[PDB]
């Protein structure tokens, strides 16, 4: 068998789609191979290295009746665009190949249930067409990976890896597979500032209602604080992804709605007790409401942690 | 006639469009066929199996003057993209074919009137071009179907099937048709949490208004609860599909609007009776309102069930 | 001249664009023609009918130096995609042609001023390239039209027609034109439920304000009902098309805004009369307001009917 | 030099993009030219005029070694789609050419500062490749322009023109340029109904606050009218183009916000004077507020006219 | 080595994408080169300059076995569209080349943390394929740059530059690189009018609450001013870019929310002190609130300046 050295490098992640579950990149694929049948002596005044396009070089190989180690991108989505496809040929028969491209790729491992605390997995598979007794992939050391970013991005890359495996077609011979994989995360700082801090203030305004004496005014104030929560919710709607299943962020907001609505219902009942002449009993229930309100939020937090992270 | 064995497998459902009524996939089409005229003996040192691209192989067939069993995708929409198209040729004349693609498909059976409790039907048709006395489709057993999903999705597949039929063109000979079909559903859990629970609380706040004594304050509170319902409605608008016809979900929300508006009108009339000095009569009508309000919702639920599910 | 029989059938209307004024379809074009110069006798064991692709068949015609009746789609927009293009050739020289496609088409007749009560006209033109003394179109009977729909759609087709005309280029010979045209409408049921019923309730709440005694409370209630109308308006914005000209629906909503705003202004003036000590006069004007409010809506309806439907 | 007669006609304006500054059309390009070297005598039974596709005809010209007057579209954007490209050849050597297309075009002259009272300029440039001593453009009279529209549109065309100029490349010979240009406007009727009338009512409600006696109630009413203005503003947001610079419409709405906010601040100060026991002074300032409020709007209108239209 | 003179000019910036980090243009690439092997004498009556398309000219070079100085666009994104590709050939062997195109380009340097006061960097790289001892780039003086704009735009260009560098592939010979770069900014005038002025008025209304005597009314007014801020926030949402990280504009709006919410909480506590009979102490704390409110905004401004601009 003949050894083929291969590597892949990604310049830039050009987009990520959370609803369709795919991602897009710009990158470069490189292969080194040696074929002694291609060795030559340069003509008088000719340079020491010959250069062809892939279209030009494949004709040369067909005129010599030489087999090319062809390969394919197994999780590609749609059409792929090439910026350049270039070949250098050595005096000794060494072939150096390079192709540079733009493309989209399938991402079947995406899972957003722990949003915004989620970490996602990305990969690209390259497959040999011929079986492993003709051609065997070897890992080109030093080349493969991701380049550095230059401004400010949405996703932060945490880990990068490459390894070699096999695949099979037509129930015959196994063939080589090359894998590049990486992991990435969000800026949690941004969600603290945009969502948590203002919701905590809204929660505080609802608690402060128990500090006043007239139940009539309380009903007005509690009602208005529920409309304020709803108004805020649509103001953040563009930061929430459109998914047909439940997230941690969804559970948090619905639970806040439930507790704030219950404050309206309680103050109506305290007014009813006052109208029936049971002021002292209503005054006693008020004292229990003040202390149990923060305990309800603390026990809800604990519940969400158990259901989503264990 | 000559037997052609065929099968189709879908890796991933890459999108679903409810307004245009189409869907998109990535998959693989496989065909086995035997043609003794293609049998050969391998050259000294040559492998036991020959491999060509479809473009290369069709030239070989034309040089031998052999007919190829050509086929077409009958509900395809737009252009189809190919990732690979590959042929293996056996010593005995057996041809193995494989094509891997991305494409969109028409979906004329979609019907969303029972949303969110709806179940939808999907299919793909593959048609033979030549008539059934030249070539006959046979079902390749073990291959066809859907692969497993790996994270969390919007639609859950409930059933998968394949079968064989016929089609006709130019009022001449019948020709074979191959069908793959499947059924899928939503996560109802998500709609319970996002829509039902908060609407039930809003309905409860409107009922609690009948517990208070001053009709003047009631009018204020009932009015504000109607604006709260409208505000909530636009907060959920992104979860509702843009269709030009009536759904079960539409009927549910309009009915809730009607009943909450009627509470405003009733409390104005009770205030009018008080101003004309008919307090005792107004106090009697109030007692009938308290009990009939929940009965109206229960009888509305029953009505919706009859109109949509029977 | 030589007779060419032609017909067109549409499977599915794949989209309609109200702002750009175009529509999209999937369909099939069929032509029958006879050319005795193409008659043949089948070889020993050959089938009685020969089959070619369009690319293959045109070469045969060029080798025999035979003219093909070429045609073009005159209101096509953009690029057209072909799913299949197929030819059957009879022993007697009869040619049967079929092409199946996806495409978008221009729609210059669209006019939405009577929305939602509007009915729109659609058409497709097919033109012969050669003049009518070489080739003449004849209508293929039984084939042309629209197929049946299978679930639930936005637009309902009301009428379908085909006929033959002529066109002219280079101020020379007239040439044949084939026309398919159809008409379609909306589900008015949907707009009754989504728009009319809730607006009628909002109008009723504004009338009920005249039933109360304290002008001070009336000003509060009338003001809040105007904000409720504005809130509802944005909740329906996605059902309204984005057009740069006036519709019947636009006129209806602006008129409702005018009348509800005038109720706020009137109640402020009644409070001013009370402050200046003219209660009896203010009480008299109130009685005229109660009866004239419904008359204003009835006379507005009559006005809109005259301006838009006559 | 050889005279080339040229003309251009546009059927339909298929879209206009205000943020990207481009427009799209469907149209037809026509050229007449005479070349005696192409004269011929028709064969026995042949028609008097020969017809070719552009691909076919250019081969004929190359076999005779004849130069074709090639041209290019100088402000084209992206790819252009052709529906038909057709050639008629006369017995005397006269060539008649026709191409029919869909395409997008650059629009660098767009300027929206006077919105909605703006009038915009559109153009298309066609350039000769060869210099003017080989080939000279002449204007084909009677053909060029715009066709009639058939329903109801967003933009109304006010003026259409064509003329001839020159261009230069490689600092050598001047070459011909053909220009078609036109001007268009909006329906102002639509903006009167959708924006002006309701804003004028909101302005009137704010003035009516000065007619009441209790400053306490005034503060409530003035505050609520400011929230009503904000609510209305988002209801019209879809009619406003997304531009990164100031328009006349923007200035109008911000000025209305400023004046309505100032009414809230004034009524708080009048309440402060009442609390400090200076009722008579506060009552005097109220009389000045009533008359100066309409004068502020009149002087603002005058200011906007001077800044934008002079 | 052979000198190649190169230059690039951009007509129009056709779009800018802040979320994907790319931009689009229309422009023209020009190259001058001399090759004595191409010198010729013109035939009797032939013009003094020959003209070919790139496809035509490359054939001529292959028939003479002459090497072409090929090049590539190194940060191109997707497919590039050509409007024209043209060659002039001089009697003395001088080649003049021109290509005119539409395309999108990668923009990895974008960084929006200082929005709206940000200034962004753009560039385009052109790379030689052959190494620098065959061909060397030289800068074509007078040609390169940006053209003038004609109406009103979103971005204003502040600086333009070109320079020459090198690049390396296959660890062999260095090759030439040509760079064009430019810088651009926003209209700050627009953001002053749309965001700052109305927020400053909202801030002023919240301060004026401390001028009134009844804490009961203050709580109502402070609550309503918080809902007004939230309503305004969604009215401007379309002017804010959708980025997953914190901007200066984000920090400004969250800080305003915090301070306005704190006014609601303070007035509830002053009412509690009044109910417990500590009016004089509450009256004293009120005097400290009036002066410290503006100081909080001034010190917040200073803090934001330090964190973002130093
Ligand atoms: C960070 C902004 C969103 C906060 C969501 C928190 C809801 C879940 C509470 C339990 C968190 C468990 C620790 C990870
Ligand atoms: C599940 C969230 C939406 C609930 C809609 C229920 C409206 C229909 C009531 C009758 C249901 C009949 C049982 C399927
Ligand atoms: C059907 C929902 C919209 C109703 C619009 C009615 C406004 C026009 C009133 C006059 C109608 C004339 C009869 C067609
Ligand atoms: C027509 C609807 C928008 C009205 C905008 C008017 C603001 C400018 C006032 C001065 C107009 C000057 C006359 C053209
Ligand atoms: C210009 C409209 C937005 C204003 C944002 C100002 C917030 C930052 C305050 C400190 C500015 C420092 C001077 C550049
Ligand atoms: C979180 C809701 C607290 C409600 C406080 C009032 C409780 C009233 C209940 C009366 C029936 C026991
Ligand atoms: C949180 C809502 C509290 C509702 C309490 C209802 C208690 C019902 C008691 C009935 C006694 C007559
Ligand atoms: C669901 C609406 C209940 C209305 C309660 C008040 C009924 C008043 C009707 C007076 C006329 C009979
Ligand atoms: C739900 C609205 C109740 C309206 C009841 C109106 C009854 C009209 C009676 C007229 C008697 C003078
Ligand atoms: C539809 C508006 C009705 C207004 C009712 C009050 C009329 C007051 C007018 C006083 C001046 C004649
Ligand atoms: C619908 C608004 C009614 C306004 C009536 C104004 C009447 C002005 C009369 C002035 C008398 C001093
Ligand atoms: C348009 C704003 C009018 C304000 C009316 C009240 C003026 C009060 C000013 C007191 C200080 C001179
Ligand atoms: C439109 C707002 C009016 C504000 C008037 C303030 C006048 C300050 C005078 C201070 C005197 C103590
Ligand atoms: C910006 C918030 C100002 C709050 C004014 C009232 C302060 C009350 C604090 C009482 C506890 C010290
Ligand atoms: C800005 C909010 C002010 C809250 C002040 C709380 C002070 C707590 C003192 C407790 C004394 C019993
Ligand atoms: C339905 C799950 C209840 C979650 C309560 C939310 C509490 C979160 C505390 C931070
Ligand atoms: C117009 C149909 C009335 C439907 C009433 C809604 C009641 C739903 C109860 C769950
Ligand atoms: C400006 C046209 C006035 C239209 C009034 C609307 C009344 C509609 C009654 C159904
Ligand atoms: C900042 C420019 C002030 C414009 C005032 C608006 C008045 C318009 C009167 C119709
Ligand atoms: C969290 C950063 C606090 C910023 C306060 C905003 C003050 C801006 C003054 C113009
Ligand atoms: C801003 C937080 C104040 C907490 C007050 C607690 C009173 C018991
Ligand atoms: C939260 C549900 C309370 C139900 C109260 C019923 C009173 C009759
Ligand atoms: C009277 C107020 C008591 C506050 C207790 C708070 C316990 C969390
Ligand atoms: C729900 C319609 C009630 C109509 C009341 C009419 C009173 C004059
Ligand atoms: C006085 C309250 C009676 C509650 C009856 C509720 C019947 C559903
Ligand atoms: C509807 C316009 C009324 C104008 C009233 C003017 C009072 C001075
Ligand atoms: C006192 C109420 C009279 C109601 C008259 C209604 C006429 C439409
Ligand atoms: C419109 C600004 C008024 C400032 C008033 C200041 C009072 C101390
Ligand atoms: C007492 C009201 C006077 C109204 C004057 C209006 C001047 C425009
Ligand atoms: C009694 C009002 C005092 C105002 C002081 C303002 C200091 C910024
Ligand atoms: C990832 C865990 C999700 C569980 C939801 C209850
Ligand atoms: C699917 C049943 C719909 C019936 C609507 C009344
Ligand atoms: C279709 C008639 C429209 C007339 C508008 C006044
Ligand atoms: C077109 C004139 C604009 C001037 C803006 C002040
Ligand atoms: C550009 C400086 C950003 C720092 C954010 C704290």
| Residue-wise DSSP of D55-121 | HHHHHHHHHHTPPP--EEETTEEEEEEEEEEEEEE-TTSEEEEEEEEEEEEE-TT---TTTTS-EEE
How many Å separate Cα B25 from the centre of its chain? 13
Picking from B109, B188, B178, B122, the residue whose alpha carbon sits closest to that of residue B154 is B188
Nearest residue, CB atoms, D154 vs list C223, C243, C257: C243
Contacts of E265 in chain A (CB under 8 A): 204-205, 208
Residue A280 in contact with residue A257, Cβ under 8 Å?
no
Ligand positioned closest to the Cα atom of A196: 1
Residues paired with D138 in a beta bridge: D5
Is the CB of B266 within 6 Å of ligand 8?
yes
Q: What angle do CA C79, C82, C85 make, to 5 degrees?
A: 140
Residue B118 in contact with residue B111, Cβ under 8 Å?
yes
How many angstroms is it from A304 CA to the middle of ligand 31? Answer: 10
How many angstroms is it from B74 CA to the middle of ligand 30? Answer: 80
User: If you search the block for the tokens 């702002």, which residue do you land on?
Assistant: C19
Residue A97 CA to residue B193 CA, distance in Å, equals 55
CB–CB contact D152 C78 (8 Å): no
Q: What are B174's two structure tokens?
A: 């019948």
Judge whether A129 is closer than 8 Å to chain B, CB to CB. yes
Nearest Cα residue in chain B from A215: B212
Longest dimension (CA), chain A: 116
Output phi, psi for E198, to 5 deg: -65, -35
Residue C189 in contact with residue B247, Cβ under 8 Å?
no
Nearest Cα residue in chain C from B169: C98
Q: What are D271's two structure tokens?
A: 């309440």
Ligand 20: which of E192, E229, E252 to mutate, most ligand atoms within 8 Å of CB?
A: E252
Residue C3 in contact with residue C32, Cβ under 8 Å?
no
Judge whether D280 is closer than 8 Å to chain E, CB to CB. no
**Distances A15 to A49, A103, A113, E13 between C-alpha atoms, Å:** 38, 10, 21, 22
- Mode of pairing for the β-strands spanning B2-17 and B145-146: parallel
Contacts of C234 in chain D (CB under 8 A): 234-235
**Distances A18 to A115, B14, B238, E22, E169 between C-alpha atoms, Å:** 12, 12, 16, 20, 36
Contacts of E251 in chain A (CB under 8 A): 193
Residue A250 CA to residue A257 CA, distance in Å, equals 11
Atom of ligand 35 nearest to the CA of E113: 1
Residue A99 in contact with residue A82, Cβ under 8 Å?
yes
Q: Could you give the dihedral angle defined by the CA atoms of residues A199, A204, A207 and A210, in that order, rounded to the nearest 10 degrees?
A: -140
H or E element at residue C271: helix C248-275
Determine whether the annotation assigns residue C21 to a binding site: no
Ligand 34: which of D254, D305, D308 to mutate, most ligand atoms within 8 Å of CB?
A: D308
Residue A146 in contact with residue A10, Cβ under 8 Å?
yes
CB–CB contact E224 D219 (8 Å): no
Judge whether E244 is closer than 8 Å to chain A, CB to CB. yes
How many Å separate Cα E20 from the centre of its chain? 12
The count of C-alpha atoms lying within 13 angstroms of the C-alpha of E155, restricted to the half-sphere facing its C-beta, is 22
Is the CB of A263 within 6 Å of ligand 6?
yes
Contacts of C109 in chain D (CB under 8 A): 150-151
- Mode of pairing for the β-strands spanning C71-73 and C119-128: antiparallel
Output phi, psi for E152, to 5 deg: -140, 130
- Strands (E) across chain E are located at 2-17, 22-34, 50-53, 71-73, 76-89, 94-106, 119-128, 135-139, 145-146, 156-168, 174-185
Q: What are A302's two structure tokens?
A: 């604990």
Residue A182 in contact with residue A157, Cβ under 8 Å?
yes
Is the CB of A304 within 6 Å of ligand 31?
no
Q: Identify the sign of the CA torsion C188, C193, C194, C197.
A: positive
Residue E125 in contact with residue E73, Cβ under 8 Å?
yes
Picking from C264, C158, C248, the residue whose alpha carbon sits closest to that of residue C215 is C264
CB–CB contact D187 C245 (8 Å): yes
CB–CB contact D233 E228 (8 Å): no
How many angstroms is it from E284 CA to the middle of ligand 14? Answer: 11
Residue E146 in contact with residue E10, Cβ under 8 Å?
yes
Is the CB of D282 within 6 Å of ligand 12?
no
The count of C-alpha atoms lying within 13 angstroms of the C-alpha of C179, restricted to the half-sphere facing its C-beta, is 14
Residue B87 in contact with residue B68, Cβ under 8 Å?
no
Contacts of D225 in chain C (CB under 8 A): 223
Resolution for this experimental structure (Å): 2.3
Judge whether A179 is closer than 8 Å to chain B, CB to CB. no
Judge whether E88 is closer than 8 Å to chain D, CB to CB. yes
Which residues fall within 8 angstroms of residue E255, CB to CB, at 6 or more apart? E300, E304
Judge whether E194 is closer than 8 Å to chain D, CB to CB. yes
How many Å separate Cα A169 from the centre of its chain? 31
CB–CB contact B153 A106 (8 Å): no
Q: What are E296's two structure tokens?
A: 């909080």
How many Å separate Cα C6 from the centre of its chain? 26
CB–CB contact C154 B254 (8 Å): no
Q: After which residues is chain E broken (C to N over 2.5 A)?
A: none
CB–CB contact C250 D26 (8 Å): no
Ligand 34: which of D109, D111, D112, D113 to mutate, most ligand atoms within 8 Å of CB?
A: D113
Contacts of E189 in chain D (CB under 8 A): 245-246
Atom of ligand 19 nearest to the CA of D301: 9
Is the CB of D264 within 6 Å of ligand 13?
no
Residue A31 CA to residue E115 CA, distance in Å, equals 44
Residue D186 CA to residue C245 CA, distance in Å, equals 9
Residue A66 CA to residue A2 CA, distance in Å, equals 13
Q: Which residues of D are annotated as a binding site for Zn(2+)?
A: 42, 91
Q: Identify the sign of the CA torsion C264, C267, C272, C273.
A: positive
How many Å separate Cα A76 from the centre of its chain? 17
Q: What are E207's two structure tokens?
A: 């301060």
Q: How was this structure determined?
A: cryo-EM
Judge whether D287 is closer than 8 Å to chain E, CB to CB. no
Q: Provide the number of CB pairs (under 8 Å) joining chain B to chain C.
A: 112
In this structure, what DSSP letter does residue E223 have? H
Q: Identify the sign of the CA torsion B43, B46, B50, B55.
A: negative
Nearest residue, CB atoms, B212 vs list A226, A265, A268: A268
Residue E74 CA to residue A11 CA, distance in Å, equals 11
CA distance B113 to chain C (A): 8
Measured in Å, how far apart are chain B's first and last C-alpha atoms? 50
Residue A206 CA to residue A203 CA, distance in Å, equals 5
In this structure, what DSSP letter does residue A214 have? -
CB–CB contact E211 D268 (8 Å): yes
Contacts of E275 in chain A (CB under 8 A): 212-213
Judge whether B114 is closer than 8 Å to chain C, CB to CB. no
Say whether D141 sits in a helix, a strand or coil: coil
Nearest residue, CB atoms, D245 vs list E154, E205, E225: E154
Total Cβ atoms within 10 A of residue B200: 11
Contacts of C20 in chain D (CB under 8 A): 14-15
Residues B158-188: b if buried by 16+ CB within 10 A, e if exposed: eeeebeeeeeebeeeeebbbbebebebebbe
- Mode of pairing for the β-strands spanning E145-146 and E2-17: parallel
Q: Which of D212, D223, D226, D283 would you mutate first to test chain C, the one with the most C CBs within 10 A?
A: D212
Q: What are C158's two structure tokens?
A: 């009301």
Which residues fall within 8 angstroms of residue C150, CB to CB, at 6 or more apart? B108, B109
Residue E33 CA to residue E5 CA, distance in Å, equals 6
Q: Identify the sign of the CA torsion B294, B299, B305, B307.
A: negative
Ligand positioned closest to the Cα atom of B267: 8
H or E element at residue B29: strand B22-34
CB–CB contact D151 C237 (8 Å): no
- Strands (E) across C142-195 are located at 145-146, 156-168, 174-185
Phi-psi region of A72 (alpha: psi -120 to 50; beta: other; left: phi over 0): beta
CB–CB contact A254 B212 (8 Å): no
Residue B227 in contact with residue B306, Cβ under 8 Å?
no
Phi-psi region of B296 (alpha: psi -120 to 50; beta: other; left: phi over 0): alpha
The count of C-alpha atoms lying within 13 angstroms of the C-alpha of E37, restricted to the half-sphere facing its C-beta, is 9
């Amino acid at each position: 068998p003949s050894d083929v050295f291969i590597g892949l490098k990604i310049d830039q992640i050009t987009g990520i789609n959370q609803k369709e579950e795919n991602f897009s990149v710009v990158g470069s694929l490189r292969i080194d191979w040696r074929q002694p049948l291609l060795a030559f002596e340069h003509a008088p005044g000719e340079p020491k290295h010959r250069t062809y396009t892939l279209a030009t070089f494949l004709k040369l190989l067909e005129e010599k009746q030489i087999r090319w180690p062809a390969f394919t991108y197994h999780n590609q989505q749609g059409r792929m665009d090439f910026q350049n496809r270039l070949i250098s040929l050595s005096e000794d028969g060494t072939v150096m190949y390079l192709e540079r491209f733009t493309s989209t790729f399938q991402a079947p491992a995406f899972d957003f249930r722990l949003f915004p605390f989620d970490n996602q997995l990305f990969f690209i598979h390259v497959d040999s067409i011929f079986p492993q007794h003709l051609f065997r992939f070897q890992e080109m050391q030093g080349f493969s990976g991701l380049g550095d970013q230059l401004g400010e991005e949405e996703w932060i890359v945490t880990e990068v890896n490459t390894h070699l495996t096999t695949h099979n077609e037509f129930t015959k011979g196994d063939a080589s597979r090359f894998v590049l994989e990486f992991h990435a995360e969000r800026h949690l700082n941004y969600y603290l500032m945009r969502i948590l801090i203002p919701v905590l203030l809204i929660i505080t305004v609802s608690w402060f209602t128990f500090f006043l004496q007239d139940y009539t005014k309380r009903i007005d104030l509690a009602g208005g604080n529920l409309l304020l929560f709803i108004a805020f919710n649509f103001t953040i709607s563009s930061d929430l992804p459109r998914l047909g299943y439940i997230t941690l962020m969804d559970a948090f907001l619905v639970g806040t709605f439930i507790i704030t609505a219950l404050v309206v219902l309680g103050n109506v009942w305290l007014r009813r007790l006052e109208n029936h002449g049971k002021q002292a009993l209503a005054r006693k229930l008020d004292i229990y409401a003040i202390t149990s309100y923060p305990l309800a939020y603390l026990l809800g937090a604990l519940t969400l942690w158990l259901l989503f992270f264990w």
